[PDB]
Design an enzyme around this catalytic site. Structure first.
Site, PDB file in Angstrom:
ATOM      1  N   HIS A  78      -9.043   5.803  -5.107  1.00  0.00           N
ATOM      2  CA  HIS A  78      -8.860   4.438  -4.617  1.00  0.00           C
ATOM      3  C   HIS A  78      -7.470   4.241  -4.031  1.00  0.00           C
ATOM      4  O   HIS A  78      -7.272   3.314  -3.242  1.00  0.00           O
ATOM      5  CB  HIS A  78      -9.177   3.392  -5.712  1.00  0.00           C
ATOM      6  N   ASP A 102     -13.238   8.787  -9.268  1.00  0.00           N
ATOM      7  CA  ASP A 102     -12.046   8.179  -8.674  1.00  0.00           C
ATOM      8  C   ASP A 102     -10.882   9.168  -8.623  1.00  0.00           C
ATOM      9  O   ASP A 102      -9.731   8.816  -8.899  1.00  0.00           O
ATOM     10  CB  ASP A 102     -11.642   6.909  -9.425  1.00  0.00           C
ATOM     11  N   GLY A 158       0.285  -0.210  -9.648  1.00  0.00           N
ATOM     12  CA  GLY A 158       1.015   0.855  -8.993  1.00  0.00           C
ATOM     13  C   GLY A 158       1.181   2.113  -9.812  1.00  0.00           C
ATOM     14  O   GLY A 158       1.897   3.022  -9.380  1.00  0.00           O
ATOM     15  N   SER A 160      -1.635   3.819 -11.236  1.00  0.00           N
ATOM     16  CA  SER A 160      -2.792   4.698 -11.166  1.00  0.00           C
ATOM     17  C   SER A 160      -2.320   6.059 -10.673  1.00  0.00           C
ATOM     18  O   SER A 160      -1.386   6.151  -9.874  1.00  0.00           O
ATOM     19  CB  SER A 160      -3.868   4.121 -10.245  1.00  0.00           C
TER      20      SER A 160
HETATM   21  C1  LIG Z   1      -9.825  -5.410 -12.517  1.00  0.00           C
HETATM   22  C2  LIG Z   1      -8.884  -4.206 -12.218  1.00  0.00           C
HETATM   23  C3  LIG Z   1      -7.805  -4.104 -13.347  1.00  0.00           C
HETATM   24  C4  LIG Z   1      -8.167  -4.434 -10.848  1.00  0.00           C
HETATM   25  C5  LIG Z   1      -9.736  -2.903 -12.157  1.00  0.00           C
HETATM   26  N1  LIG Z   1     -10.346  -2.698 -13.451  1.00  0.00           N
HETATM   27  C6  LIG Z   1     -11.676  -2.079 -13.572  1.00  0.00           C
HETATM   28  O1  LIG Z   1     -12.366  -1.929 -12.617  1.00  0.00           O
HETATM   29  O2  LIG Z   1     -12.111  -1.670 -14.865  1.00  0.00           O
HETATM   30  C7  LIG Z   1     -13.447  -1.232 -15.012  1.00  0.00           C
HETATM   31  C8  LIG Z   1     -13.812  -1.470 -16.442  1.00  0.00           C
HETATM   32  C9  LIG Z   1     -13.386  -0.227 -17.185  1.00  0.00           C
HETATM   33  C10 LIG Z   1     -13.490   0.922 -16.164  1.00  0.00           C
HETATM   34  C11 LIG Z   1     -13.556   0.268 -14.766  1.00  0.00           C
HETATM   35  O3  LIG Z   1     -14.759   0.536 -14.133  1.00  0.00           O
HETATM   36  C12 LIG Z   1     -14.731   0.332 -12.726  1.00  0.00           C
HETATM   37  C13 LIG Z   1     -14.150   1.612 -12.065  1.00  0.00           C
HETATM   38  C14 LIG Z   1     -13.199   1.506 -11.129  1.00  0.00           C
HETATM   39  C15 LIG Z   1     -12.629   2.785 -10.499  1.00  0.00           C
HETATM   40  F1  LIG Z   1     -11.387   3.016 -11.012  1.00  0.00           F
HETATM   41  F2  LIG Z   1     -13.441   3.844 -10.754  1.00  0.00           F
HETATM   42  C16 LIG Z   1     -12.533   2.626  -8.983  1.00  0.00           C
HETATM   43  N2  LIG Z   1     -13.211   3.564  -8.128  1.00  0.00           N
HETATM   44  C17 LIG Z   1     -13.121   3.417  -6.623  1.00  0.00           C
HETATM   45  C18 LIG Z   1     -13.784   4.345  -5.780  1.00  0.00           C
HETATM   46  C19 LIG Z   1     -13.701   4.202  -4.386  1.00  0.00           C
HETATM   47  C20 LIG Z   1     -12.947   3.144  -3.819  1.00  0.00           C
HETATM   48  C21 LIG Z   1     -12.287   2.224  -4.656  1.00  0.00           C
HETATM   49  C22 LIG Z   1     -12.378   2.372  -6.059  1.00  0.00           C
HETATM   50  N3  LIG Z   1     -11.659   1.386  -6.962  1.00  0.00           N
HETATM   51  C23 LIG Z   1     -11.743   1.508  -8.396  1.00  0.00           C
HETATM   52  O4  LIG Z   1     -11.069   0.599  -9.284  1.00  0.00           O
HETATM   53  C24 LIG Z   1     -10.205  -0.277  -8.538  1.00  0.00           C
HETATM   54  C25 LIG Z   1      -8.766   0.112  -8.405  1.00  0.00           C
HETATM   55  C26 LIG Z   1      -8.383   0.163  -9.832  1.00  0.00           C
HETATM   56  C27 LIG Z   1      -6.940  -0.153 -10.196  1.00  0.00           C
HETATM   57  O5  LIG Z   1      -6.454  -1.230  -9.984  1.00  0.00           O
HETATM   58  N4  LIG Z   1      -6.183   0.897 -10.910  1.00  0.00           N
HETATM   59  C28 LIG Z   1      -4.800   0.693 -11.396  1.00  0.00           C
HETATM   60  C29 LIG Z   1      -3.645   0.719 -10.425  1.00  0.00           C
HETATM   61  O6  LIG Z   1      -2.489   0.675 -10.690  1.00  0.00           O
HETATM   62  N5  LIG Z   1      -4.085   0.831  -9.062  1.00  0.00           N
HETATM   63  S1  LIG Z   1      -2.852   0.844  -7.897  1.00  0.00           S
HETATM   64  O7  LIG Z   1      -1.850   1.892  -8.140  1.00  0.00           O
HETATM   65  O8  LIG Z   1      -2.158  -0.446  -7.921  1.00  0.00           O
HETATM   66  C30 LIG Z   1      -3.574   0.912  -6.234  1.00  0.00           C
HETATM   67  C31 LIG Z   1      -4.642  -0.109  -5.834  1.00  0.00           C
HETATM   68  C32 LIG Z   1      -2.659   1.389  -5.110  1.00  0.00           C
HETATM   69  C33 LIG Z   1      -3.752   2.315  -5.664  1.00  0.00           C
HETATM   70  C34 LIG Z   1      -4.532   1.178 -12.817  1.00  0.00           C
HETATM   71  C35 LIG Z   1      -4.695  -0.330 -12.529  1.00  0.00           C
HETATM   72  C36 LIG Z   1      -3.413  -1.181 -12.666  1.00  0.00           C
HETATM   73  F3  LIG Z   1      -3.438  -2.327 -11.926  1.00  0.00           F
HETATM   74  F4  LIG Z   1      -3.376  -1.532 -13.988  1.00  0.00           F
HETATM   75  N6  LIG Z   1      -9.120  -1.010 -10.441  1.00  0.00           N
HETATM   76  C37 LIG Z   1     -10.099  -1.496  -9.390  1.00  0.00           C
HETATM   77  C38 LIG Z   1      -8.898  -1.658 -11.777  1.00  0.00           C
HETATM   78  O9  LIG Z   1      -8.103  -1.236 -12.576  1.00  0.00           O
END
Ligand SMILES: CC(C)(C)[C@@H]1NC(=O)O[C@@H]2CCC[C@H]2OC/C=C/C(F)(F)c2nc3ccccc3nc2O[C@@H]2C[C@@H](C(=O)N[C@]3(C(=O)NS(=O)(=O)C4(C)CC4)C[C@H]3C(F)F)N(C2)C1=O
Ligand SMILES: [Zn+2]
Length: 200
Positions: A78, A102, A158, A160
């Site tokens: 993602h 992911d 930020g 992940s």
């Molecule tokens: C509500 C919430 C907290 C925003 C969301 N929770 C959530 O969905 O929990 C459910 C319940 C328990 C498991 C999970 O099942 C869903 C699976 C999601 C996934 F991971 F498989 C995923 N597969 C994708 C594949 C293709 C395209 C996009 C995809 N998008 C995904 O997830 C999305 C993104 C991920 C994200 O925000 N990750 C973090 C982060 O820092 N990102 S980042 O660096 O800023 C940035 C966006 C620059 C890269 C660590 C969390 C931080 F903010 F803490 N998400 C949404 C969330 O965490």
């Protein structure tokens, strides 16, 4: 569009810093500013020295983390999509891509250090964020862990692609998602290191 000659190309993921875990203090270091990041993303040519296990990475629109485990720089799909990573010889194509997990991986950059996959079976974990915060996490399942001290999701945004480590400093997983109530992250979900070891 329909005009192929003007269709654009997405840039490379670019290493812009690292989380320094070498000494007694964890701290983030920036190694490239926004202007150089943009240029490096377009060319895919990054001549900067790479060090350490946890890299801060960026695209044109997102910033997150990437973690080296057994010679593969791993991060989240993602964040990276299918993008190449910038390297001294030009863009490098992903060696692993799994949207279902992911997860993506590239060959670890020369100069990086790799974490060792955890074989301890320990459930006392530690999440490392992009601000070099070390967050105790109790493992609650194959891919979920609870924060001992919950905090607003803003503190985890930020991060992940960052590692969850065991007490011995082995890699246990790659931080993937947050589980929140009213904007407070109480738990995290991660790609288990065994799921990485299978992908490999
Ligand atoms: C509500 C919430 C907290 C925003 C969301 N929770 C959530 O969905 O929990 C459910 C319940 C328990 C498991 C999970 O099942 C869903 C699976 C999601 C996934 F991971 F498989 C995923 N597969 C994708 C594949 C293709 C395209 C996009 C995809 N998008 C995904 O997830 C999305 C993104 C991920 C994200 O925000 N990750 C973090 C982060 O820092 N990102 S980042 O660096 O800023 C940035 C966006 C620059 C890269 C660590 C969390 C931080 F903010 F803490 N998400 C949404 C969330 O965490
Ligand atoms: Zn261990």
């Amino acid at each position: 569009g329909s005009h192929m000659a003007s269709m654009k190309k997405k840039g490379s993921v670019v290493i812009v810093g690292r989380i320094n875990l070498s000494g007694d203090t964890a701290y983030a270091q920036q190694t490239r500013g926004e202007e150089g990041c943009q240029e490096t993303s377009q060319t895919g040519r990054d001549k900067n020295q790479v060090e350490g296990e946890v890299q801060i990475v960026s695209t044109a629109t997102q910033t997150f983390l990437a973690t080296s485990i057994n010679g593969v720089l791993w991060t989240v799909y993602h964040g990276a999509g299918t993008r190449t990573i910038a390297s001294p010889k030009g863009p490098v194509t992903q060696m692993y891509t799994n949207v279902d997990k992911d997860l993506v991986g590239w060959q670890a950059p020369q100069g990086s250090r790799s974490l060792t996959p955890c074989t301890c079976g320990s459930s006392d974990l530690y999440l490392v964020t992009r601000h070099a915060d070390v967050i105790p996490v109790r493992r609650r399942g194959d891919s979920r862990g609870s924060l001992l001290s919950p905090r607003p999701i803003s503190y985890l945004k930020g991060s992940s692609g960052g590692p969850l480590l065991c007490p011995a400093g082995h890699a246990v997983g790659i931080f993937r998602t947050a589980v929140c109530t009213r904007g407070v992250a109480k738990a995290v979900d991660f790609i288990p290191v065994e799921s990485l070891e299978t992908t490999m």
